[PDB]
Prior knowledge:
Radius of gyration of chain A: 22 Å
CATH superfamily of the largest domain in chain A: NAD(P)-binding Rossmann-like Domain
Binding site for Mg(2+) (chain B): 317
CATH architecture of the largest domain in chain A: 3-Layer(aba) Sandwich
GO cellular component, one term (chain B): cytosol
Shape of chain A: globular
Binding site for NADP(+) (chain B): 148, 150-151, 171-172, 204, 226, 252, 275
Structural class of chain A: alpha/beta
Strand order of the largest sheet of chain A: 8-7-6-9-10-11-12
Oligomer: homodimer
Number of domains of chain A: 2
Number of strands of chain A: 12
Largest interface: A-B, 56 and 56 residues
GO molecular function (chain B): glyoxylate reductase (NADPH) activity; hydroxypyruvate reductase [NAD(P)H] activity; metal ion binding; NAD binding
CATH class of the largest domain in chain A: Alpha Beta
Number of helices of chain A: 12
Pfam family, one (chain B): 2-Hacid_dh
Amino acid sequence: SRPRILVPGKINPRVLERLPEMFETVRIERADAALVTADMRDVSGIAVSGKLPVPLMDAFPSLEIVANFGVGYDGVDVSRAAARGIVVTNTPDVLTEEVADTAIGLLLNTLRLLPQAEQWLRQGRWVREGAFPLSPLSLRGRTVGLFGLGRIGLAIARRLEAFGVSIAYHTRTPREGLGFTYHPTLVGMAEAVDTLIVIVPASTLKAVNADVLSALGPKGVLINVGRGSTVDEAALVTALQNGTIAGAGLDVFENEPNVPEALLSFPNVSLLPHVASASVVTRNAMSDLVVDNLKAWFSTGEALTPVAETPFRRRA
Amino acid sequence: RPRILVPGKINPRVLERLPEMFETVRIERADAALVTADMRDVSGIAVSGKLPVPLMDAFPSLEIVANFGVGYDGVDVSRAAARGIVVTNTPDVLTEEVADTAIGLLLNTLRLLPQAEQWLRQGRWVREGAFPLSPLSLRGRTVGLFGLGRIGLAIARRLEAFGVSIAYHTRTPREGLGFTYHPTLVGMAEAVDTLIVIVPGTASTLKAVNADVLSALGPKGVLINVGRGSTVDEAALVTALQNGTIAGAGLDVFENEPNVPEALLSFPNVSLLPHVASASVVTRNAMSDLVVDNLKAWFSTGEALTPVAETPFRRRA
């Protein structure tokens, strides 16, 4: 019979629309083991956006595959899935250009204060008060340091080159044939650049700390489009308050959808609710890749975009 | 020390640097009625915005009008040229900045980043969940540049790196360019889904972006105006947005700035900026420097740095 695919919690409707091509669908209102009933013993696969708790993942003896919606899969315990022989797929490549677009957008918005300028116009202030204040910052003359690279980092770099900015990067191992300036230390890169873009596609927990920010300097701008936990929140707030850095743009946070109240108060900070890939067309392509992974697995025994930790083939 | 009139508001950097070579004369507004008898000896003007002809013609010794900005519509250049008055503007030093703003506006129009930010700041991420998915994207789009120039090229250069095709429409095509030329605007609009209005040249484009150009652009069509407000038929744009004839618009310029038509403020798929193209501290400082440097160059060497095309003049003492 049609394999049974569990979808816990909210997911893009396009996933649900396309699952019935090959599958029977099982929904639970939230990603919670307590919602699992006895008749779900025959679940073979999971399609999920966001957190997949280990107790839910391990409630299914026939589970073969976790199709993760998103290029990041921190919400899936990949080590535990790998240990149980469960293949894990993600959604790379189909969102790369979109995410890079958002990152440039965030950066331009952080530097030039375009959303505030728009707000100023919409509130009637252009007429009565005159011109929106001049943005203290600009992309002109800036040097960018990429913390992490990957296909997304390359895409961002490619865009930034066309803006006439120098590109540096920091990764554990350098890359051959690139033409960006490599830096074996983060702090050293931060010393050499005024704009730090956190991508981090290894542990980087609190890597962007008080010393990295201090090194970045008083014209320094931090853009986080990677992992919220990579940035030391308390250190960022202090640095913004003291003018140790000049500004920041953040698309990710430690405890989404909550955003620290202190960050909301700064006039030189741009904040987005994790919209990196959040267009209809890109989220549809991601939805298609989730489903196509499942279809490919169950029909050919080979997934399309398995994660690096699970290069598996189906046995049945 | 030549006397330089500065009428109305101007970047403080201009006022800081004028005393290097000049005596400065301020009037609170660009108005001939503020002119007193002791200002007869004014030799030059530095001005941002409108320079009314009566003010310009109040000064028999006037040699030079140093315009703050690449656009100089506020100066009657034909009248200045007729009186032998050189006019300078501020090109080049703002090109990359303006192109940056245009890309920003475009990304904001398509991806709704300012609304997403507003949604977060209003507490809606917690209470309601994710910001709605943006109906539009830059992915798969084709861009048509209405007008080109150094700013157009700069925009195109950026857009190529985003993996978008570039078309352009100008009166005469350009040799050795990688872009698809279109002798008609409406034809370009048929071929593309994203129309960026730049129109840097001499020629008239009054209401060129009309109901038919918008209709041609189509129901996935996006209009970005970073050129001249008057180039877009405002009534036609509003109707097209209301009927879903086009999908969205981003505007940095308006017909009667700083006033913005009330109807345009109501649309959820429109991004509006108060003419911030060049409005960074660093670019406005470079513009300020070029205004002053034009004056200094004129009065010290008899040659301006960036005289406008209509006044290729040299100083006679």
